[PDB]
């Protein structure tokens, strides 16, 4: 999960990293605010 803490220490919002591709981009940058662009993200998982 990506967690945002306020000044008092509470968790105010979060991102589930494995929900979709945008959530993965946000978790990679450790940020809720990403710049406009074209990014490469984690490939589709291949398991036996």
């Amino acid at each position: 999960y990506l967690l945002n803490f306020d000044v008092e220490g509470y968790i105010t919002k979060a991102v589930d990293c494995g929900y979709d591709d945008l959530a993965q981009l946000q978790c990679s940058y450790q940020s809720f605010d990403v710049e406009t662009g074209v990014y490469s993200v984690s490939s589709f998982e291949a398991s036996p």
Binding site: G18, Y19, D20, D21, L22, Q24, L25, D33, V34, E35, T36, G37, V38, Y39, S40, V41, S42, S43, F44, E45, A46, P48
Partner: protein
Amino acid sequence: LRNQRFVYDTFDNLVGYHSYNGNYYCVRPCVSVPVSVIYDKVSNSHATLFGSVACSHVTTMMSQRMTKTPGPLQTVVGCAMGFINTSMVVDECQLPLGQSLCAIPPNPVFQIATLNFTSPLTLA
């Protein structure tokens, strides 16, 4: 050689196998498809491009969380999701996709357009 049963490459990785059913199988390590994300901050929307993948394989692999309204679209750089083909034409853009393609964000689905530059003055 079939009687040696295993075929290897120069790094001593297995690349082939002779089965007792009589067939020969090429062997490859498990592969993963590339994924790219097109994001527009102003509208807070996104789309995806599977580079080098035909739309059929990605259609199947999804059945194997959200990725798994327009259908997938084939471009010269791979299969695109969340995009409408626009016969549109531009001379500048923010989100290039390679091979003279770029993505037009929605003014608050994405549009695919081409890049074409024109000479200012032609004099015979």
